[PDB]
Design an enzyme around this catalytic site. Structure first.
Site, mmCIF file in Angstrom:
data_model
loop_
_atom_site.group_PDB
_atom_site.id
_atom_site.type_symbol
_atom_site.label_atom_id
_atom_site.label_comp_id
_atom_site.label_asym_id
_atom_site.label_seq_id
_atom_site.Cartn_x
_atom_site.Cartn_y
_atom_site.Cartn_z
ATOM 1 N N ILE A 1 -10.467 9.196 0.031
ATOM 2 C CA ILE A 1 -10.353 8.041 -0.855
ATOM 3 C C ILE A 1 -10.314 6.778 -0.006
ATOM 4 O O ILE A 1 -9.519 6.699 0.941
ATOM 5 C CB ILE A 1 -9.088 8.108 -1.743
ATOM 6 C CG1 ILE A 1 -9.190 9.214 -2.772
ATOM 7 C CG2 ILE A 1 -8.785 6.747 -2.396
ATOM 8 C CD1 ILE A 1 -10.158 8.948 -3.912
ATOM 9 N N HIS B 1 -29.511 -14.344 24.231
ATOM 10 C CA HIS B 1 -28.500 -14.128 25.256
ATOM 11 C C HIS B 1 -27.701 -15.373 25.601
ATOM 12 O O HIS B 1 -26.696 -15.253 26.316
ATOM 13 C CB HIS B 1 -29.166 -13.583 26.524
ATOM 14 C CG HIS B 1 -29.559 -12.152 26.421
ATOM 15 N ND1 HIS B 1 -30.383 -11.620 25.443
ATOM 16 C CD2 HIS B 1 -29.218 -11.113 27.222
ATOM 17 C CE1 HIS B 1 -30.507 -10.318 25.640
ATOM 18 N NE2 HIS B 1 -29.824 -9.984 26.721
ATOM 19 N N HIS C 1 -4.109 3.425 -3.569
ATOM 20 C CA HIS C 1 -4.295 2.954 -2.199
ATOM 21 C C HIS C 1 -3.512 1.679 -1.922
ATOM 22 O O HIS C 1 -2.867 1.565 -0.868
ATOM 23 C CB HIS C 1 -5.793 2.741 -1.917
ATOM 24 C CG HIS C 1 -6.047 1.720 -0.849
ATOM 25 N ND1 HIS C 1 -5.971 2.003 0.496
ATOM 26 C CD2 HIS C 1 -6.296 0.389 -0.950
ATOM 27 C CE1 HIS C 1 -6.185 0.890 1.177
ATOM 28 N NE2 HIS C 1 -6.371 -0.105 0.327
ATOM 29 N N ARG D 1 -19.956 -16.476 38.853
ATOM 30 C CA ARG D 1 -19.824 -15.017 38.793
ATOM 31 C C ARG D 1 -19.564 -14.422 40.170
ATOM 32 O O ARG D 1 -18.824 -13.446 40.298
ATOM 33 C CB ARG D 1 -21.057 -14.383 38.139
ATOM 34 C CG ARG D 1 -22.339 -14.421 38.935
ATOM 35 C CD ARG D 1 -23.436 -13.629 38.229
ATOM 36 N NE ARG D 1 -24.685 -13.818 38.921
ATOM 37 C CZ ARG D 1 -25.610 -12.910 39.099
ATOM 38 N NH1 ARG D 1 -25.453 -11.698 38.603
ATOM 39 N NH2 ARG D 1 -26.716 -13.240 39.760
ATOM 40 N N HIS E 1 0.837 -1.198 0.000
ATOM 41 C CA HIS E 1 0.000 0.000 0.000
ATOM 42 C C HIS E 1 0.871 1.248 0.000
ATOM 43 O O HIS E 1 1.418 1.634 1.047
ATOM 44 C CB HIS E 1 -0.908 0.007 1.229
ATOM 45 C CG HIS E 1 -1.815 -1.163 1.290
ATOM 46 N ND1 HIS E 1 -1.404 -2.414 1.689
ATOM 47 C CD2 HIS E 1 -3.144 -1.236 1.049
ATOM 48 C CE1 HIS E 1 -2.446 -3.227 1.628
ATOM 49 N NE2 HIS E 1 -3.514 -2.537 1.261
ATOM 50 N N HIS F 1 -2.463 -0.915 7.111
ATOM 51 C CA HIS F 1 -2.026 -1.180 5.751
ATOM 52 C C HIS F 1 -0.931 -0.223 5.309
ATOM 53 O O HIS F 1 -0.159 -0.562 4.403
ATOM 54 C CB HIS F 1 -3.221 -1.111 4.772
ATOM 55 C CG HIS F 1 -3.928 0.199 4.758
ATOM 56 N ND1 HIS F 1 -4.906 0.546 5.673
ATOM 57 C CD2 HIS F 1 -3.788 1.247 3.905
ATOM 58 C CE1 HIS F 1 -5.358 1.738 5.329
ATOM 59 N NE2 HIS F 1 -4.698 2.197 4.274
ATOM 60 N N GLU G 1 -18.756 -3.276 24.007
ATOM 61 C CA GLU G 1 -17.908 -4.454 24.193
ATOM 62 C C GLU G 1 -16.686 -4.439 23.296
ATOM 63 O O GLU G 1 -15.590 -4.819 23.721
ATOM 64 C CB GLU G 1 -18.670 -5.758 23.972
ATOM 65 C CG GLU G 1 -19.855 -5.978 24.899
ATOM 66 C CD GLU G 1 -21.125 -5.337 24.448
ATOM 67 O OE1 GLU G 1 -21.157 -4.761 23.310
ATOM 68 O OE2 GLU G 1 -22.105 -5.385 25.218
HETATM 69 C C1 LIG Z 1 -26.212 -3.550 29.047
HETATM 70 C C2 LIG Z 1 -27.635 -4.030 28.893
HETATM 71 C C3 LIG Z 1 -28.719 -3.235 29.050
HETATM 72 C C4 LIG Z 1 -28.773 -1.799 29.447
HETATM 73 C C5 LIG Z 1 -29.453 -0.970 28.395
HETATM 74 O O1 LIG Z 1 -29.539 0.383 28.864
HETATM 75 P P1 LIG Z 1 -30.613 1.215 28.038
HETATM 76 O O2 LIG Z 1 -30.625 0.881 26.600
HETATM 77 O O3 LIG Z 1 -30.382 2.614 28.382
HETATM 78 O O4 LIG Z 1 -31.976 0.712 28.698
HETATM 79 P P2 LIG Z 1 -32.938 1.303 29.790
HETATM 80 O O5 LIG Z 1 -33.283 2.690 29.471
HETATM 81 O O6 LIG Z 1 -32.026 1.387 31.115
HETATM 82 O O7 LIG Z 1 -33.940 0.315 30.086
HETATM 83 S S1 LIG Z 1 -30.227 -4.072 28.773
HETATM 84 C C6 LIG Z 1 -29.335 -5.623 28.953
HETATM 85 N N1 LIG Z 1 -27.971 -5.298 28.533
HETATM 86 C C7 LIG Z 1 -26.952 -6.324 28.249
HETATM 87 C C8 LIG Z 1 -26.481 -6.269 26.861
HETATM 88 C C9 LIG Z 1 -25.161 -5.971 26.634
HETATM 89 N N2 LIG Z 1 -24.673 -5.946 25.336
HETATM 90 C C10 LIG Z 1 -25.495 -6.233 24.270
HETATM 91 C C11 LIG Z 1 -24.896 -6.239 22.959
HETATM 92 N N3 LIG Z 1 -26.783 -6.479 24.427
HETATM 93 C C12 LIG Z 1 -27.291 -6.542 25.697
HETATM 94 N N4 LIG Z 1 -28.581 -6.873 25.797
HETATM 95 C C1 LIG Z 2 -11.546 -1.752 3.466
HETATM 96 C C2 LIG Z 2 -10.046 -1.784 3.628
HETATM 97 C C3 LIG Z 2 -9.245 -0.709 3.441
HETATM 98 C C4 LIG Z 2 -9.615 0.665 2.997
HETATM 99 C C5 LIG Z 2 -9.217 1.691 4.018
HETATM 100 O O1 LIG Z 2 -9.532 2.993 3.506
HETATM 101 P P1 LIG Z 2 -8.756 4.132 4.299
HETATM 102 O O2 LIG Z 2 -8.653 3.863 5.748
HETATM 103 O O3 LIG Z 2 -9.389 5.388 3.912
HETATM 104 O O4 LIG Z 2 -7.303 4.034 3.649
HETATM 105 P P2 LIG Z 2 -6.554 4.847 2.534
HETATM 106 O O5 LIG Z 2 -6.636 6.283 2.807
HETATM 107 O O6 LIG Z 2 -7.443 4.615 1.212
HETATM 108 O O7 LIG Z 2 -5.302 4.191 2.265
HETATM 109 S S1 LIG Z 2 -7.558 -1.054 3.737
HETATM 110 C C6 LIG Z 2 -7.950 -2.804 3.611
HETATM 111 N N1 LIG Z 2 -9.351 -2.883 4.027
HETATM 112 C C7 LIG Z 2 -10.023 -4.155 4.349
HETATM 113 C C8 LIG Z 2 -10.495 -4.198 5.737
HETATM 114 C C9 LIG Z 2 -11.845 -4.296 5.961
HETATM 115 N N2 LIG Z 2 -12.325 -4.375 7.260
HETATM 116 C C10 LIG Z 2 -11.461 -4.372 8.330
HETATM 117 C C11 LIG Z 2 -12.038 -4.512 9.644
HETATM 118 N N3 LIG Z 2 -10.157 -4.231 8.175
HETATM 119 C C12 LIG Z 2 -9.646 -4.181 6.905
HETATM 120 N N4 LIG Z 2 -8.316 -4.119 6.809
HETATM 121 CA CA LIG Z 3 -8.808 7.353 3.027
#
Ligand SMILES: CC1=C(CCOP(=O)(O)OP(=O)(O)O)SCN1Cc1cnc(C)nc1N
Ligand SMILES: CC1=C(CCOP(=O)(O)OP(=O)(O)O)SCN1Cc1cnc(C)nc1N
Ligand SMILES: [Ca+2]
Ligand SMILES: [Ca+2]
Lengths: 675, 675
Positions: free
Chosen positions: A185, A476, A259, A354, A25, A64, A413
């Site tokens: 780009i 879940h 690129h 837990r 690249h 890259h 997460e």
């Molecule tokens: C953190 C979590 C919650 C709080 C939501 O917080 P919120 O959207 O603000 O809801 P509320 O206004 O408080 O009722 S639900 C259960 N969960 C675990 C949970 C964690 N990660 C993913 C991907 N999905 C989930 N389901």
């Molecule tokens: C799409 C992709 C790229 C373009 C970047 O585009 P950019 O950040 O704007 O880079 P640039 O300015 O063009 O050099 S690299 C290779 N890749 C595949 C690629 C896809 N998804 C993840 C998670 N990681 C990667 N590595």
């Molecule tokens: Ca770019």
């Protein structure tokens, strides 16, 4: 000028490396060479001591573009040479096609999967703030370093970077300085086709400071000034918008074609002549550039020399903190720290794993200062916070302090996973953890795989591991999750059955230096087992119930070990003698001696596995497998176990069928193989 | 008023459902009942025809709040009753703890994993725009429906929603109207602890329109007016900020404790009396509320009746389009569409399976209008765009049209996965696909698992499947990825070896109605195989080379089938006779009859698997497994295969060792089991 010559040298080393490999690249390296020159001239680092704890860190999130990073490392006299650049992208070289921290001196993290590096930078900066709050004293700026990150449009499109950028803004991480390669780009062409958001307005909404450099193809004065400006804003991370031309200087500059493929040979010739280089020469390193860069290295080495004297003086002024810091920089845990791990007997009450995990953390956090961690908005469910600790927050919020030990990651997460990698990358023996439900560790798979490839000792506290969680239902309840991570190289996947096994899992996770851990923990209570100990569980797999005349051995993990023990009693009433093996971590078990492993899984006896999730992998250890290969159900957990026949009678029935299936057959251990 | 009584009814049904289960989430239902009432009164839907193609769609992205959704469905006379509400969260009920589209009438998608539902809503809206552009004519608004989404703080923290929201803003999706439950509370407490960004400023930066409702606990007039306002903004998706009190009305309102556990019995009593209900009664449904809701249903049914007449008139005015639309609404592909699939012979040239995929798409897109798809910024690498098609873009950009068929997802794998689920959820026989590198399908695992649980026929075009990609190195090379998805229930993971197998994989993917597909495709060229056909490959596994006196059978996939065939020749020179089985899809194979499967993997002969990734799963089909259980390397692909001994001689050596290992042993098919 020498600075102009250095920028050209960087550009042409990167182009020549791509040309030699006929792969890679060139575009972003061409566009970012001015910024790389400017940033490295501001950075404090020692090419001869890549682990100096007060170095500034650099992260190339747009991995890259690594021909750029490798060129900088070579020019600065890291343990990487022009001969290594000639071997870019060649099997076994020190210059792989994306940077790997295990292989490349001066690569802090492993990047390439887009979005990861900026999140790693957030974690390096989080760790630096926590570390400085822990150790710095008046007249003793033990830690005062910055974290510099380059990222591109692709990293900005990946959701993980949004998560980490929101959190970094919340955390007021003023020593983080990121640079966006604003070249408009990507692979599919103009960003107008898919990425028309106002990035700067979005970063302001997170609480970041912004500096714009509209002519970043040439204006190194403005890039340096942007760094100075960022350093004055101590309560916000900064995004520096670098408006560049991808492939700057190429005939094909400003196009997607530059690129990701080598330049044409005639293009490289005109690059060299426009910049005063010999078009017949490759891998040129003008001695004046080396001299200029060497002077910066020598100045940085004098800075580190003075830091070493500051550290010696700190050890006299602050004897206890100084000894703690020295131990951490030596990579050693406190002597006998593991005496704090809780130990249980079979007379003790049933406890969910837990909750056993909460108890472990409560005992070891006060004893091991380099443990920090958090949860992705699941603190009261994962049980990841020790009572009496304070949260990691900027003091300005009133909600914590940078000296705090508990991180509120929010519902993030994936970023939590990549931030943990950055905390580990900081060094100083950090042993850091992150809680969520096991099923949602999957949201962070991009980062988890990089923990394994990068050899970072991070830990996932992954509760609510199975259908045992009950009513939240199949959205879940893990099925595939253990198999996924066990199939990934270099992941220790502990599924402890009881109190002693949970302590062994933490002993492994905290002692780790090169292997990430996932601890799969229960919502529901499990009994303390007759036959468990930290000693035996530390082997990863062990004989829980030995039966010299066994008709069958049942191998199980976690919540299913107690089920196996109950099945053994049912089987006794059917005239079948069973042994039980507990296998809390398959990776640790696999690493034991062949003789040890065969003592656990011998020849001459059928072996049945029991685990309430996918049967994938289990044939390594068993002849027949009782698992759950369909999605779960929403109901009270004991009713779900009954529905799927994960009961003492259901296990016994399958054990008896296994004994019958092998009648008249010669059985050898599942550990045997042809090659 | 009746509207006030309806809101109270909704609130109390949800609380009473949580109480009966002694499990679940009362807080957000209490806070969002006014908005739910207002939105459903604006929606067009038929409780007796959940599949009316011009219905407005509703998505509960904060799926834990599903007692609210179930209450609405019950009150409106969907095929869900108060008796089902009494069985909330009970094993086997129609009211699971998170909504499941396969089980709950009126649940468009499966939500609960945070962030997914809003992205699904983006996909429903994308599909509606594409569908309307394809079919609407002057005087014939065949499709003019809206997509309404509720989401909370957790969905806004998850990166996948940022990805989809950036893209939806770019795509100018004016029929998307999302509502943020701005209650400032998540599981870890106040959003001040982790989520202090300016959400509204961020959504403006994506190009969304904003409406704020500052008193959403009571002001249904303002919520209705916000919907009217959103409908006038035809070129931007709208976010409606609903400032609510979580748990509104509870003694514990405004606290994290009301998020996720049942209310106290005395709290429920005071709720009922404050709102004019009998505190001794549960699951009350005042007849005046039923009457009010029934009048809206009757009006909506008259709207659908008129739509049916519009559709009949459309079929007269536009005979060809009308027949196409009817066929799609009947769930049928074009007659004999599969005659367009390319067929190959062993005399044809070697082709990478990514290129074979491009060729398939080129032939079938013009024949099957319900195919649309895209790539996550990898269009020229995945080869996912048919020449001569136009991109799906708002015409205002000049870059495409809503009638277009190719989506530029940007670097947004996770959102692409969840958007695909929404496109499938729209219905109308959409058969939609998304390209990325196989290793980065893992970034989208949260959505992919939901494709499987939701039974949606989406397709991942997952190229660069292995170490065969070469120089990009181990950060890009799958190891665990196939095992992960094969271990997930209900995922068809095709790894075709050649042209005929690639056509079979697409036949399966496009004919699917209930099973998502992942097509694992090569960067590198592979030969056309002697013995392959669409017919045999459609069985998922088949005997490629039959050897009646086989000493061993080699089972392989993808790029390793040709390797197995070459190993057979080496083995012949060593006096060993081998057969070859190709196993392009393990799920399809597993679904064949026992007798068919045993004809492929018979008793009485050792079986060796060969696939250049994890050995997990392979013991289902083999006695010994040759795989790759470590990370890859950065170099030219043939050199990597040689390093790891994936060569004809390396396979032959392991085959010979397998034959020797089973000398003197009785061997039965890996398909046999004890239970
Ligand atoms: C953190 C979590 C919650 C709080 C939501 O917080 P919120 O959207 O603000 O809801 P509320 O206004 O408080 O009722 S639900 C259960 N969960 C675990 C949970 C964690 N990660 C993913 C991907 N999905 C989930 N389901
Ligand atoms: C799409 C992709 C790229 C373009 C970047 O585009 P950019 O950040 O704007 O880079 P640039 O300015 O063009 O050099 S690299 C290779 N890749 C595949 C690629 C896809 N998804 C993840 C998670 N990681 C990667 N590595
Ligand atoms: Ca770019
Ligand atoms: Ca909330």
């Amino acid at each position: 000028s020498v600075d102009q010559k250095a920028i050209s040298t960087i550009r042409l080393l990167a182009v020549d490396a791509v040309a030699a490999a006929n792969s890679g690249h060139p575009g972003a390296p061409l566009g970012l060479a001015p910024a790389a020159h400017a940033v490295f001239k501001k950075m404090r680092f020692n090419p001869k001591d890549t682990k100096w704890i007060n170095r500034d860190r650099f992260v190339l999130s747009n991995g890259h573009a690594c021909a750029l990073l490798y060129s900088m490392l070579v020019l600065y006299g890291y343990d990487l040479t022009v001969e290594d650049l000639k071997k870019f992208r060649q099997l076994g070289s020190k210059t792989p096609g994306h940077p790997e921290n295990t292989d490349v001196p001066g690569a802090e993290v492993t990047t390439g999967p887009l979005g990861q590096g900026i999140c790693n930078g957030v974690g390096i900066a989080l760790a630096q703030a926590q570390f400085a709050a822990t150790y710095n004293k008046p007249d003793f700026p033990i830690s005062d370093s910055y974290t510099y990150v380059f990222l591109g449009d692709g990293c900005l499109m990946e959701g993980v970077s949004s998560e980490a950028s929101s959190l970094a803004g919340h955390l007021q991480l003023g020593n983080l300085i990121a640079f966006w390669d604003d070249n408009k780009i990507s692979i599919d062409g103009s960003t107008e086709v898919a990425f028309t958001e106002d990035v700067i307005a979005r970063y302001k909404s997170y609480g970041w400071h912004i500096v714009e450099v509209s002519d970043a193809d040439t204006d190194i004065t403005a890039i340096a000034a942007a760094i100075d400006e960022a350093k004055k804003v101590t309560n916000k991370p900064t995004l520096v918008r670098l408006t560049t031309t991808i492939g700057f200087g190429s005939l094909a500059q400003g196009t997607h074609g530059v690129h990701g493929a080598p330049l044409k040979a005639d293009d490289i010739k005109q690059l060299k002549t426009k910049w005063g280089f010999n078009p017949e020469e490759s891998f040129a390193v003008p001695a004046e550039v080396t001299a200029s860069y060497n002077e910066h290295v020598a100045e940085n080495q004098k800075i580190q020399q003075q830091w070493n004297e500051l550290f010696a003086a700190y050890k006299q002024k602050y004897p206890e903190l100084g000894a703690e810091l020295q131990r951490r920089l030596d990579g050693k845990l406190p002597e006998n720290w593991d005496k704090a791990l809780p130990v249980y007997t079979p007379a003790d009450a049933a406890v969910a794993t837990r909750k056993l995990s909460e108890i472990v953390l409560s005992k070891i956090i006060p004893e091991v200062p380099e443990i920090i961690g958090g949860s992705a908005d699941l603190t009261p469910s994962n049980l990841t916070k020790a009572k009496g600790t304070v949260d990691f927050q900027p003091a300005a919020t009133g909600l914590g302090d940078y000296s705090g030990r508990y991180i509120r990651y929010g519902v993030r997460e994936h970023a939590m996973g990549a931030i943990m990698n950055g905390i580990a990358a900081f060094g100083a023996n950090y042993k850091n953890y992150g809680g969520t439900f096991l099923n949602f560790v999957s949201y962070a798979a991009g980062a988890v795989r990089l923990s394994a490839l990068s050899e970072f000792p991070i830990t996932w506290v992954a509760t609510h591991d199975s259908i045992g969680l009950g009513e939240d239902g199949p959205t879940h309840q893990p099925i595939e999750t253990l198999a996924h991570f066990r199939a990934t190289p270099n992941i220790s996947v502990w599924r402890p059955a009881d109190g002693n096994e949970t302590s062994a899992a933490y002993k492994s996770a905290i002692e780790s230096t090169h292997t990430p851990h996932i601890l799969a923990l229960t919502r529901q209570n499990l009994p303390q087992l007759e036959g468990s100990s930290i000693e035996k569980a530390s082997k990863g797999g062990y004989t829980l119930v030995q039966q010299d005349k066994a008709d069958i051995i049942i191998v199980a993990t976690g919540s299913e070990v107690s089920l196996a023990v109950d099945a053994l009693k049912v089987l006794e009433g059917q005239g079948i003698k069973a042994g039980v093996v507990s296998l809390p971590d398959q990776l640790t078990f696999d690493k034991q001696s062949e003789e040890y492993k065969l003592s656990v899984l011998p020849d001459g006896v059928p072996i049945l596995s029991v685990e309430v999730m996918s049967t994938f992998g289990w044939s390594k250890y068993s002849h027949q497998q009782f698992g759950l290969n369909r999605f779960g159900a929403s109901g009270k957990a004991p009713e779900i176990f009954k529905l799927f026949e994960f009961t003492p009678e259901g296990v016994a029935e399958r054990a008896a069928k296994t004994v019958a299936f092998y009648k008249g057959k010669d059985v050898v251990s599942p550990l045997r193989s042809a090659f």
